[PDB]
User: Fold Deoxynucleoside triphosphate triphosphohydrolase SAMHD1 from Homo sapiens.
Amino acid sequence: MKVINDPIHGHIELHPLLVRIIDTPQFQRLRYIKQLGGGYYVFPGASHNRFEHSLGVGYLAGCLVHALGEKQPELQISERDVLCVQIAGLCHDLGHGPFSHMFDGRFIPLARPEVKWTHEQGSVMMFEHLINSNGIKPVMEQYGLIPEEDIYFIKEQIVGPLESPDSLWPYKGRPENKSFLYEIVSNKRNGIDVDKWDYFARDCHHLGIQNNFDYKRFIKFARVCEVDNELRICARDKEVGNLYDMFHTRNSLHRRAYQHKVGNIIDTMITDAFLKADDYIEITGAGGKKYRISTAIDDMEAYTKLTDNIFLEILYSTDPKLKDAREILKQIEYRNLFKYVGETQPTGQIKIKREDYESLPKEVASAKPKVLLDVKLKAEDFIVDVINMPIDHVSFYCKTAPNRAIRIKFAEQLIRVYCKKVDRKSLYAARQYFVQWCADRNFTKPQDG
Amino acid sequence: MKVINDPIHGHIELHPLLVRIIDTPQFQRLRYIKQLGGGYYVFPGASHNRFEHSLGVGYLAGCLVHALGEKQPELQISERDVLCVQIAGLCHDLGHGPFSHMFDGRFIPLARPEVKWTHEQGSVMMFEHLINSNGIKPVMEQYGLIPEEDIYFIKEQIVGPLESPDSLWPYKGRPENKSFLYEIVSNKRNGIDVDKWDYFARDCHHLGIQNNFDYKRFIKFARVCEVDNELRICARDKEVGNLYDMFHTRNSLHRRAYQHKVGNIIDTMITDAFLKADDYIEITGAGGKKYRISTAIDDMEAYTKLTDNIFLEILYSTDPKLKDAREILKQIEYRNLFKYVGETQPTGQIKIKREDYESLPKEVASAKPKVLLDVKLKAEDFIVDVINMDYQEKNPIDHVSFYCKTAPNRAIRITLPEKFAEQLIRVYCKKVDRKSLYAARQYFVQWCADRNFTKPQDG
Ligand SMILES: Nc1nc2c(ncn2[C@@H]2O[C@H](COP(=O)(O)OP(=O)(O)OP(=O)(O)O)[C@@H](O)[C@H]2O)c(=O)[nH]1
Ligand SMILES: Nc1nc2c(ncn2[C@@H]2O[C@H](COP(=O)(O)OP(=O)(O)OP(=O)(O)O)[C@@H](O)[C@H]2O)c(=O)[nH]1
Ligand SMILES: [Zn+2]
Ligand SMILES: [Zn+2]
Assistant:
C-alpha cells in the first residue's frame, strides 16, 4: 500500500480506498487553494495548500481511532470504522473555496447576502460529487464499507447532525454506543480534534511560530471513558501540560497569524477584486452552463474548477471589463494597500451576522461625526471586515484505576475598518466616521495609535 | 526597514531599496512558480515557490558580505557593495519559467531545439525589465548606488562574465581586489554559495529531509584570505566536518528528491501537455502582440505573465483544440502516469545535449530488438528525459580553501559523496499494457547497447 513522505508526520501510508478518493479532480483541486488565504502575502513561508493539510488530518484521524482500537477492544472498533473516520478526516475540507476562509467567511456573504453557505456544507456536496463522478461506491464495498450507512457517517463527521435540528441521538451513520467516533475529526465539545492538531502543527511549521504541543503523546495516552452518562474521548491528566501547550499554540496562531493586521487587509482587497470581477469571470459547470465566482457554489462540477487560479485569471486578463478588478490586484502587487482606520468590538456577545456585512460600509458613511469636516466619504470608500473566533471543558481519566472520568485576551468578534482613499485628508475623515459609527451602535470606543 | 518572518531564517530585515524591488509585478511573479516543479505531486509538503527562496538568498548574501566586512575592514566592503550583493541574491531566480527547472531544462529544448535558453539569461533579462518598468534607477542613486556600474555588477553575479574573453580579469562591475564578492551568490568553482544554502535548507524543511549543514557556523568562521595572489573566501579547518555535511545534504536531495522517479515522470507529462498546448495558448506581450508558451521568453512583458498558472489554464480549458493537452493533465490527476521502463548512463561517452533531446524518442523506436515481438512501438510511444545534477564532472571539495586560526591570512595547502555531475537517462512508455511494456524495454535495452550506454540493471 501507498506511502507519502510528509514534513509534519513523516512516512504515512494510505489504504488503497483512500488513494482512490485522493486521485480525483475533486480532491486534487485542493492543491490550488492556499491554506491561509492572503496570509502568504504577509508570511512568505505560508505557501501550503488545503491538500497536504487534508492528507494530514486523514492520517491523524486514522491514528487516533486505531489507537483506541488496540487499547480498548471492548469498544468494538472495526477496520470499517477506521476507514470511515479516515475518509472523513481526508475529505473534511473539500468544500473550501478560493483562499479558504476568505471565500465563505467574507466573499459569498458580500456577493449573495441572502444565501446560507459554509465550507463544511460544501464539503459534503463536493464529496457526494466526488464519489458519484468516480464510481467510488463499489470500491468502498470492495473494501468492506456499507455505502447506505457509511456515507451518512462520513458526511456527519464533517457537517454535524444531518436531520438537524433534542436529547435523543441525531446521527444515522453510527449508534450512540459509538458516539465518541464523532469526536475525532471535528469536535465542538472541545477545541480538540485531529483537524486542529494538523493545522496547528502545519501552520506553525510554515509560519515560523513556536509549536509547543506533541499530538503523538496525546494519542498514546488518550482513551474512552464514561462522562455524564455518555462515551467521550478522555486524556491522562499527566498530559494537562500538553493540553495547555496546545491552547497556547492556538492563541499564538490567532494573535500572530490569523488575526494579523496586514494579512487581513489583503484578504479584503482580494475579495474586492473578486466582487468587481463577478459579472465577467466565467466558470463552466455541468452541461456547459457558465457560472460566476459567486454562483459556482450551486454546481459542484463548476466549483471543482473554482480555485486560487481565479486570482491570476483576473491579474492576467485583457478584457477592459475586468480592469477595475485587475487594478486592485495590482495595488496588492505594488503594496499600495487599503489603509487601517481602527478596531472595535460589540458589547457584549452580540455578533454581527454574515447577512448584514454588505450593509456595514453604508452604515459607516452614514455616521455623523460631531465636528463637521473637510472631506466627504461614500459607502464604497470603507471596508468593514468582521473577524471571528480554560481546560476544565476536557475529560480526564486516571492511569491507576483507568476506568471513568476523574473530573471534579479576548474576544469573539473584532470589527475593523479600512479606507480605500489614501490621502491624509480622507483618512482623517474616515476615522471620525468610524468613531461615531461605534457610538451609534454602542460598540467599545476605538483606541488611538 | 521591513521585517519579514521566514520559517528558515527567522526575522529578515529588508532595506527600503530591496523592498522597492520586491513590490514589483516582475518580482511578485515568483510566488506563482513552484520551487521543485512537479515535485509537489510526489512530496505533499513541497508547495514552496521561487519567491520566498529568493528572499532567503538575498538575506543570506547580505549576511555573508556583512560578516566578511565587519571582521576584516581592510577589504573596504562598502554598504553600496552589500546592497548590490543582496540585490543579486534577490533577483538571481527572476528568469525561471513555469515549474522551474522543467521549463528551461526540458520544455524549451523540446519546443525550440535551436535556441540557447537558460534561466540565468532569463534573470538578467527580467532584471532589466524590472528596473525600467519601475523607475528603480533613481531609487538606487537615492541610496548610494551607481546604476550604470552597479546594475552591470548585479548581472555579473547572476550569470557570470558578460562580455568575455583569454586570461585577464573578466568582470567590469568590480575590480579584482573585490573578486570575493563574485563567489557569494553563485560559485561553480567549489560548489559553495548562498543560493545553495537557502534551498538546501528550504527544500529539506518542506520535504521532511534532515539538513546537517549549518550555514550560520559557516558564516561565523568564513574569512577572505590569499590564494595564488587572488583573494578568496575561506573556511576554517575546524569547520571541515560541516562542509562534508553540506555535500552529503546536497547528495541526499538529488538522490531522494530532484532525481525522484515518479516526480520526473510527472515533469515529462506536464511538458508533454505544454507541447500540445503550445499552438493554442496566447500570451499578450509588448504592444498587444501575442506569444506562445515557447516564445514568451522572447518578450519579458509576456514572460512576466507566464507562470504555473498555465497548468490550470490548460486544465480548465473548454477549447476543443486543447483537448489533448487537457487529457494529459487529467491523467496526472487520476494518476494514470507514463510507465517507467529503465535507466541508463552515458559513462565514458559524450553527454547528450539539449539540442538533441527532441530526436531521442525516434532513436529508441528505431532500435529494433534482436528477438522479435508481436508488439511494435512508435516514437510517440516513448519518453526519454535526461536528468542532470549537474553542477561538468569534477570534485568541488578539492577547491575549498581553508585557513588556520594561527595564520588567518594564508590559505592552507591541502591534497565524502561520489558523483557531482552525472547525466542520467530514463525512458518511459505512454502505453501501459504489460506486453507493450515488455516491448518498450526491449527497444530500450537495444538503444543503450548500440549507443554504448550502461546496460540497464534488471528492472
Ligand atoms: N513590502 C512587502 N512586505 C511583505 C511582503 N511579503 C510579506 N511582507 C510582510 O508584510 C509587511 C507589509 O506591511 P507593512 O508595510 O509593514 O505595514 P504598514 O504599512 O507599516 O502598516 P498598516 O498601514 O497599518 O497596515 C511587511 O512588514 C513584511 O513583514 C512583500 O512581498 N512586500
Ligand atoms: N496516489 C498518489 N500518490 C502521491 C500523491 N502525492 C504524493 N504522492 C507520493 O508520491 C509517490 C509517487 O507515487 P505514484 O504517483 O502513485 O506513482 P506510481 O503508482 O508508480 O504511478 P505509475 O507510473 O502510473 O505506475 C508516492 O510514493 C507517494 O508517496 C497523490 O496525490 N496521489
Ligand atoms: Zn482542516
Ligand atoms: Zn536560487
Notes: The pocket of zinc ion (ligand 3) is lined by residues A 53, 57, 92-93, 195, 199 (CB under 6 Å). Residues 200 and 250 of chain B are 7 Å apart (CA to CA).
